[PDB]
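Good day; I would like, with your permission, to put a structural problem before you. A protein sequence and the structure tokens that stand for its backbone fold form the material at issue. Thank you for your consideration; the sequence and its tokens are set out here:
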Amino acid sequence: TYNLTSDIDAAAYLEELKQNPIINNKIMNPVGQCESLMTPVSNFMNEKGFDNIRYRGIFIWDKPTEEIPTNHFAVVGNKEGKDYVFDVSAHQFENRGMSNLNGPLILSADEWVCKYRMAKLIYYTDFSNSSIAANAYDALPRELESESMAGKVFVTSPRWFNTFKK
């Protein structure tokens, strides 16, 4: 399967993003970049005629006792009644036990979820503001057992977490 949907001109959009030398370097070297890419990717999408732009804050938990979960960020937008996710730094995880995330993704929302599932406990929340997203899905210590799952959307629900929660 694929990283770039044909439902929209994702291949063209990726090339256009990569014509920007700063974005090109961040796609070549994505580790630590998802947060800084939110604003530029949103601007890009808006100018392409996507609307209802949201900022997707994500956690990836390996185990219940992890002190700081792994975070990630993507941008979601509507085009003609369907949501698409631009996640051009997904491949920051290629070398961290998610080898299937082997390039930038521009996918429908359902394809995006599918991609992460085929690649740990993963959940997200969409926000209207990128700094709100960043704050809610930050890199400070958090205890999974006492996190509110209110407003969390599960991508995965591993057996360990269902057992953990009881």
User: Anything to note?
Assistant: The chain has six helices and six strands. The longest strand covers residues 51-61. The helical segments are 10-18, 21-28, 34-47, 109-118, 130-136, 159-165. The chain has one domain: 1-166.
